[PDB]
From Swiss-Prot:
Short name of one Pfam family: Rotavirus_VP1
Co-factor(s): Mg(2+)
Locations listed in the record: Virion
Name the record gives this protein: RNA-directed RNA polymerase
One of the record's GO molecular function terms: nucleotide binding
PROSITE patterns according to UniProt: RDRP_DSRNA_REO (PS50523)
Length: 1073
RNA sequence: UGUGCC
């Protein structure tokens, strides 16, 4: 509960010249006392009197009531920051070395020198894009510094290392003064022109980096990145994190974890000697020298010191550095610059064509319905993103403009303009609008934003390909319900003294111009073969349309802005934006890896243990009929690079016998590592999310980084959360939500009271608050109801429905209309109205909690009912599993050591149900987990009607409605739904093997009735409680359950009526992946 | 409506 105490100190620190606590209680009499206390405090403050007497008088309110919020009556002028900053600003300011970046505008010049006229100015290249101010970040660091000013021992060293660092930030910022932000947390030209262009972004990155400093090594790393970053803005991250690929090959393997037949992690005590050719060492040295040429000193030395022995025990430092560089911010070039960079492929093209044919061969011959009604499927699937051009649209009687894809389709249909049979051009006549994706370290890549004709003409086929991939292991990113651990396991498996791994990053090749010809032709050739396999008119048109999109792309043109103008240039390369983007790319890399491997063998004779393609990378494990030597590696590597070289492909191929390093993960010393480079105080782009959503997201980013090996002080995160989640009443009245409001599992939850432990209200007050918050979950929007009543809109819903189902409409119909009413949420005007409504409702709720008829049950209610029926008792679980994921914090790591981990994801969509499968066979419709959950619990007769209404044949529908499988499905649908409400596949839990035998013994549950749903919830609740206790106390306990027989029947009724809560915390988990 | 595909 330290969050509440912390908030007062921070507020007291920020303002000085009052704070009014606000409590509430589920007990009528106590609440009145809370009302009396609030009135007295306002009255006393209004008269400038002390509140000390009142606190003693209302001792009971402080002691038992639950704090809801804090009132901030501050009469200053959001200043203080200028005054506060100066004491810390003494050291010498930093000077921008305007000679380190190629492209001029990437140097820390004076804003004016970049944009002389306020009309030439643009933040397009430095916009933090986050909804929190630079001034607030600075305020947070200073506040933390003051609190930890009088600390001792090791704590002091952390303060001192941090204090030194912020000195550079403070002094440099002062030389120009703190920049001021507008209403939308943006930095305009007037504040900007006197100050160095990249000043605001740089300060944010350094502050974020410093508040994540603890050990001396952290201090050394943060300082080099900070000073260097201010000058360098385009290669520092890349230079710092490049030696990592070379490093993995060096470390030896002493006991690793592999994959077994049951596809689960199993420990192997083997030893694999690292074999590295002298040439590789020269390459690493060149990389180190390059870091040095760029002013780097401390970082290069650390890598060099490590190299003397390359002990996997002193390797965490290398890992720490790799995670660290990403925190220098994003590299945002000029669209044109990002855009500008851009006879033997016969074997390569053929494989791509063959792979495409396999993925649809069976679907095409049979005459799959999805292929037949592909157009309908695209419409249901259709998103609410952009279509490319801002159009004027009329809805009922309102004339407004939108760019949204959904809006364009509805307007077009109501004008006989809807024509998916005609796939628009993307050449010189109708150039493609561009989209951009920015990431730290790597170069900016462009994105096509093609007309919805393209999404529709490709949605059905890509879905078919994904299903094929779903069961093909070569495609690591799509295989089964696998996670990254299984992939990690597969590489280690066949590792021995007569086998070498081959990893390759082909990010450059994917964009190449050489690539697009062979790529498009291969897909097209495949499409022609598939067409020569059926006679179905519906299938051919859908198949034919897909072919057309590939042809139009072959010769494309792009609209790249060059200032304020839009130059139309010829883009002869493959860019992402299509539907088949990921699936096609995966096919292309796999075809490519296969092509290189085949050419090499003519020379060498090996065995292919495994081949894989995962994202922009691809790798393989080969086996030779002899012991691998340093000389052998050089020969295999030179030939492989040469094979890539002949195909004019620019890639980075490496050969090792112990580890590999790709974009998503890296393996060194038999251990699995994952980069932890998520930016905190700077984003990639702006969206339509609120401050609360962003605050929830920041906490999430912090949790993933903390899990991955990059920790940022929690107090700083908490401090950031307090500033972000605040709400102003006036220009001097600001309301700060309490910890209970912030952390309770409600529609307004932002973070967990205690990291790695999701709590649920076990007290009456929490329950009272939870019920109240839900009360005001959804808010109305006029602009939204308007269009929801217009003609064109209802017709669009009606046209989709009369095309989909046969019999009656409503469980399906209500969903389609709503699913379509929400898509309007991309339209800012509607988004803005919703937020304003939420705040006003929120201000009143914090002020004085309202009443609620409840009548709605949730997950928290089910858990609360169970709790009082378990008996706790100290138990003990020894550690049996060696550590394979080192970066993991100690408390999280301990649970894995004692009970183990898993290599799969727990099905939380119900897709593995027989009924869901049956719907898939005859319908293009895709029910949600929630819809399936409501549907399964319906009267046998009702279910039969619903299946028929969707097109399911009578003999099939009738057979299911009474079978054994339907009964089993009932339990399965609920199990999937319950896991979903408990986020078992997210955060820290996704790691633990909840089916662990060791975990299982700690649970004692005697059957007293026997009813699937009831048994599942008790075991799950017990498993979560035992694990959570373990996370907090580092020790274990055993659980006994004596739940009544009468009680279970009541509980079961409760279970089939659970509602789902929507909250920023929930959104953030969805947001991560 | 400072707007940006899968």
């Amino acid at each position: 509960g330290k969050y509440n105490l912390i908030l007062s100190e921070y507020l007291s620190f920020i303002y000085n010249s009052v704070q009014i606590p606000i409590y509430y209680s589920s007990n009528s009499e106590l609440e009145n006392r809370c009302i009396e206390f609030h009135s007295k405090c306002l009255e006393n403050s209004k008269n400038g009197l002390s509140l000390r007497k009142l606190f003693v008088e209302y001792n009971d309110v402080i002691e038992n009531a639950t704090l809801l919020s804090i009132l901030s009556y501050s009469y200053d002028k959001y200043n203080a920051v200028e005054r506060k900053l100066v004491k810390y600003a003494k050291g010498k300011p930093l000077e921008a070395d305007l000679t380190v970046n190629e492209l001029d505008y990437e140097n820390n010049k004076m804003t004016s020198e970049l944009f002389p006229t306020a009309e030439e100015y643009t933040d397009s290249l430095m916009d933090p894009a986050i909804l929190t101010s630079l001034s607030s970040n600075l305020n947070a660091v200073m506040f933390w510094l003051e609190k930890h000013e009088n600390d001792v021992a090791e704590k002091l060293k952390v303060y001192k290392r941090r204090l030194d660092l912020f000195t550079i930030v403070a002094s440099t910022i002062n030389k120009y003064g703190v920049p001021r932000h507008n209403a939308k947390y943006r930095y305009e030209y007037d504040v900007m022109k006197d100050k160095p262009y990249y000043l605001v972004t740089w300060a944010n990155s350094s502050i974020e980096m410093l508040m994540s400093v603890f050990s001396h090594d952290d201090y050394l790393i943060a300082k080099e990145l900070i000073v260097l970053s201010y000058s360098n803005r385009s290669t520092l991250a890349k230079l710092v994190s490049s030696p990592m690929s070379i490093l993995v090959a060096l470390v030896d393997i002493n006991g690793t974890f592999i994959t077994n037949e049951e596809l689960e992690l199993e420990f192997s005590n083997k030893y694999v000697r690292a074999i590295v050719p002298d040439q590789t060492f020269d390459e690493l040295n060149q990389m180190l020298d390059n870091m040095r040429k760029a002013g780097l000193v401390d970082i290069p030395k650390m890598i060099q010191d490590w190299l003397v022995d390359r002990s996997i025990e002193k390797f965490p430092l290398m890992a720490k550095i790799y995670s660290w560089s990403f925190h220098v911010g994003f590299r945002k070039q000029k669209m044109l610059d990002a855009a500008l960079d851009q006879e033997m492929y016969r074997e390569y093209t053929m494989l791509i064509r063959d792979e495409v044919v396999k993925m649809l061969e069976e679907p095409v011959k049979h005459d799959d319905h999805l292929l037949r009604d592909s157009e309908l499927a695209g419409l249901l699937s259709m998103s609410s993103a952009s279509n490319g051009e801002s159009r004027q649209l009329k809805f009922g009687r309102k004339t407004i403009f939108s760019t949204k894809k959904n809006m364009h389709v509805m307007d077009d249909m109501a004008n006989e303009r809807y024509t998916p049979g005609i796939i628009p051009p993307v050449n010189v006549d109708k150039p493609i609008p561009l989209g951009r994706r920015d990431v730290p370290g790597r170069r900016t890549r462009i994105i096509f934003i093609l007309p919805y004709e393209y999404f529709i003409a490709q949605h059905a086929v890509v879905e078919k390909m994904l299903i094929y991939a779903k069961h093909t292991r070569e495609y690591a990113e799509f295989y089964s319900q696998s996670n990254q651990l299984l992939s990690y396991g597969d590489v280690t498996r066949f590792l021995s003294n007569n086998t070498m791994v081959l990893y390759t990053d082909v990010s450059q090749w994917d964009s190449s111009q050489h690539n697009t010809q062979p790529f498009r032709k291969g897909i097209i050739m495949g499409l022609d073969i598939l067409a020569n396999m059926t006679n179905d008119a519906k299938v051919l048109q859908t198949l034919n349309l897909y072919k057309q999109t590939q042809i139009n792309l072959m010769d494309s043109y792009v609209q790249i802005p060059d200032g304020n103008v839009i130059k139309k240039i010829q883009y002869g390369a493959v860019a992402s934006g299509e539907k088949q983007t990921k699936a096609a790319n995966s096919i292309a890399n796999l075809a490519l890896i296969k092509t290189v491997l085949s050419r090499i063998s003519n020379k060498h004779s090996f065995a292919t243990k495994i081949i894989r393609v995962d994202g922009d990378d691809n790798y393989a494990v080969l086996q030779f009929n002899t012991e691998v030597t340093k000389q052998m590696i050089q020969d295999v590597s030179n030939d492989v690079r040469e094979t890539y070289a002949r195909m004019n492909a620019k890639v980075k191929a490496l050969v090792s016998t112990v580890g590999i390093e790709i974009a998503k993960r890296y393996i060194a010393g038999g251990k699995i590592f994952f980069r932890a480079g998520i930016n905190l105080l700077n984003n990639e782009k702006r969206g339509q999310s609120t401050q609360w959503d962003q605050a929830a997201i920041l906490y999430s980013n912090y949790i993933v980084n903390r899990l991955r090996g990059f920790e940022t002080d929690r107090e700083f995160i908490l401090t950031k959360i307090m500033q972000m989640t605040s709400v102003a009443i006036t220009g001097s009245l600001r309301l700060f939500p309490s910890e209970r409001v912030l952390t309770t599992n409600s529609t307004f939850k932002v973070f967990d009271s205690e990291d790695f432990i999701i709590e649920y209200g076990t007290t009456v007050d929490e329950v009272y608050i939870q019920r109240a918050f839900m009360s005001l979950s959804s808010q109305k929007s006029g602009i939204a109801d308007e269009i929801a009543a217009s003609s064109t809109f209802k017709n669009y819903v009606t046209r989709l429905s009369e095309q989909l189902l046969f019999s009656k409409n409503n469980i399906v119909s209500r969903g389609i209309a709503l699913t379509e009413k929400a898509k309007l949420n991309s339209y800012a005007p509607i988004s803005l109205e919703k937020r304003r409504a939420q705040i006003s409702a929120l201000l009143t709720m914090l002020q004085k909690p309202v009443t609620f008829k409840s009548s709605k049950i949730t997950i928290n209610d089910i858990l609360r009912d169970i709790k009082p029926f378990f008996t706790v008792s100290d138990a003990h679980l020894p550690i049996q599993y060696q550590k394979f994921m080192p970066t993991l914090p100690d408390n999280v790591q301990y649970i894995i050591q004692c009970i183990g981990s898993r290599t799969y994801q727990i099905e939380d969509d119900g897709s593995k149900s027989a009924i869901s499968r049956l719907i898939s066979k005859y319908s293009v419709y895709k029910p949600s987990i929630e819809e399936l959950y409501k549907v399964i619990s319906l009267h046998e007769n009702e279910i039969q009607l619903y299946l028929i209404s969707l097109g399911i044949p009578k003999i099939d529908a009738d057979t299911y409605v009474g079978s054994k499988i339907y009964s089993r499905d009932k339990y399965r649908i609920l199990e999937s739904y319950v896991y979903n409400l408990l986020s078992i596949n997210y955060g820290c839990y996704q790691l633990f093997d909840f089916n662990s035998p060791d975990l299982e013994k700690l649970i004692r549950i005697p059957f007293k009735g026997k009813i699937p749903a009831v048994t599942f919830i008790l075991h799950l609740y017990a498993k979560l409680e035992v694990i959570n206790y373990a996370i907090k106390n580092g020790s274990w306990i055993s659980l006994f359950c004596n739940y009544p027989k009468s009680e279970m029947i009541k509980l079961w009724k409760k279970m089939w009526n659970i509602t789902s809560l929507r909250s920023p915390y929930t959104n953030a988990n969805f947001f991560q992946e």
